[PDB]
């Protein structure tokens, strides 16, 4: 069987319903008249043009069959996060978006599984919303990797991680609100450069701060897009931790020892990159993810893993094995 655990949705959101939250920065979905194309829109600006598969759960199951993917986990498009908003307005919006998600997963909840979003800019509202959603049916939460200038070392974000680790709630960490200000203007560089760095920063933020020494080993946490550039740059981190007391102060073990404490999806779009990745993470902590349905997500879902020189057991774990232990799937 095949489980793709990194994919996204966007719900049937009217201009009128989103304007009631923020007729300026609440995102909404405009579908064409035919009904197989459309755009995500902030106020009345065009944000991203999207395909029917993003919002239509029936059309999506049909593609899932063409693709040979049996169960697919899916979660909010990072533009739905609303972390910049006021906390009550975001807790309201999060509640609707996760309802929409169960509504979307209704089309076939043995094959479509959902992850919820939280108002992460408020620890209390984020914690209650995380537990409600798992009880309502979501298999876990998906969070942006940072919150303005708070990275995952921030005490509040660590508190949200521990809360989930204690309630045995799995977490997918997604790059979002990328760094870099005004420089990565064209050629989609924010996805090519800033996305991988954002992820690496999140992972390194937990490690070098000692967060893993303080968070329960029971936390199920996954970092998207191969964990950014983390695995390739890990040796540069180990060498700095050995040669610099300020790198070493909050981190008792050498940083590569902590790879036993988190997961990554397999989306790295290259056999060499994939082989190095499992070499660092181990075949048990790499899962099949595709970033479906966006252009940048590997058309042939699972094709990179299946054509690899990896073990037949390694393939089985990335394709299916680890994603069902991680998410508790039949």
Q: Using CB distances below 5 to 8 A depending on partner kind, what does residue 234 bind out of Co ion, its own copies, none?
A: its own copies
Cβ–Cβ under 8 Å, residues 83 and 18? no
Residue 171: how many CB atoms within 10 A of its CB?
A: 22
Residue 207: how many CB atoms within 10 A of its CB?
A: 28
Nearer to its own copies, 22 or 275 (CB): 275
> Which tokens belong to 213?
């020494």
**70 marked ligand binding residue:** no
Nearest to 42 by CA among 32, 53, 56, 29: 29
- Taking the C-alpha atoms of residue 241 and residue 244, their distance in angstroms, rounded to an integer, is 6
Q: Using CB distances below 5 to 8 A depending on partner kind, what does residue 279 bind out of its own copies, Co ion, none?
A: its own copies
What angle, rounded to 10 degrees, do the helices at 123-136 and 87-106 form?
10
For 64-73, give one letter per residue: b (16+ CB within 10 A) or e. Answer: beebebbbbb
> Which tokens belong to 132?
């409600």
Site for Co ion contains 298 (CB under 5 A): no
Candidate list 52, 72, 98, 200; residue touching its own copies; CB under 8 A: 200
> Which tokens belong to 27?
């995102």
Candidate list 122, 153, 291, 298; residue touching Co ion; CB under 5 A: 291
Candidate list 27, 196, 293, 321; residue touching its own copies; CB under 8 A: 196
Site for Co ion contains 265 (CB under 5 A): no
The least CB distance from residue 265 to its own copies, in Å, is 13
Q: What does the radius of gyration of the chain's CA atoms come to, in whole angstroms?
A: 19
- Taking the C-alpha atoms of residue 56 and residue 66, their distance in angstroms, rounded to an integer, is 16
- Taking the C-alpha atoms of residue 15 and residue 29, their distance in angstroms, rounded to an integer, is 8
**225 marked ligand binding residue:** no
- Taking the C-alpha atoms of residue 2 and residue 4, their distance in angstroms, rounded to an integer, is 7
Q: Using CB distances below 5 to 8 A depending on partner kind, what does residue 136 bind out of Co ion, its own copies, none?
A: none
Q: Give the footprint of its own copies on residues 210-269 (CB under 8 A).
A: 225, 229, 231-240, 243-244, 246-247, 250-251, 268-269
Site for its own copies contains 179 (CB under 8 A): yes
Nearer to its own copies, 109 or 254 (CB): 254
Candidate list 143, 208, 215, 221; residue touching its own copies; CB under 8 A: 208
Binding residues: 6, 8, 174, 291
Binding positions for its own copies, rule: CB under 8 A: 146, 149, 151, 179-184, 186-189, 191-194, 196-197, 200-201, 204-205, 208-209, 225, 229, 231-240, 243-244, 246-247, 250-251, 268-270, 272-273, 276, 279-280, 295-296, 298-299
Binding residues for Zn(2+): 6, 8, 174, 291
Binding positions for Co ion, rule: CB under 5 A: 291
């Amino acid at each position: 069987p095949r489980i793709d655990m990194h994919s996204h949705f966007f719900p049937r959101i009217s201009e009128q319903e989103a304007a009631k939250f923020d007729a300026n920065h609440a995102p909404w979905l405009q579908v064409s008249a035919k009904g197989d194309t459309g755009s995500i829109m902030m106020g009345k600006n065009n944000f991203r043009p999207v395909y029917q598969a993003l919002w239509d759960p029936a059309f999506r199951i049909e593609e899932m069959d063409a693709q040979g993917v049996d169960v697919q986990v899916t979660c909010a498009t990072p533009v739905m996060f609303g972390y910049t908003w006021e906390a009550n307005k975001a807790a309201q919006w999060a509640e609707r978006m996760n309802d929409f998600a169960l509504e979307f997963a209704a089309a076939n909840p043995q094959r479509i599984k959902v992850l919820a979003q939280v108002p992460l800019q408020d620890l209390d509202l984020a914690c209650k919303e995380a537990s409600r959603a798992v009880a309502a049916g979501h298999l876990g939460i998906q969070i942006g990797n940072h919150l303005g200038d708070k990275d995952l070392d921030d005490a509040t974000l660590e508190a949200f991680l521990t809360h989930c680790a204690n309630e045995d709630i799995p977490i997918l960490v997604h790059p979002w609100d990328m760094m870099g200000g005004q420089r990565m203007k064209k050629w989609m560089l924010p996805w090519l450069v800033a996305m991988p760095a954002e992820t690496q920063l999140a992972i390194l933020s937990l490690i070098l701060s000692g967060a893993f020494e303080r968070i329960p080993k029971s936390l199920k946490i996954c970092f998207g897009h191969g964990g950014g550039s983390f695995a390739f740059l890990l040796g540069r981190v180990d060498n700095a931790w050995r040669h610099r007391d300020i790198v070493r102060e909050d981190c008792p073990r050498p940083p590569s020892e902590y790879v036993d404490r988190f997961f990554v999806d397999s989306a790295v779009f290259n056999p060499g990159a994939l082989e190095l990745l499992v070499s660092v993470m181990g075949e048990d902590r790499v899962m099949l993810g595709s970033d479906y349905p966006f252009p940048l997500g590997e058309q042939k879902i699972g094709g990179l893993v299946l054509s690899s020189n990896l073990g037949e057991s390694a393939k089985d774990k990335i394709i299916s094995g680890n994603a069902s232990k991680f998410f508790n799937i039949n």
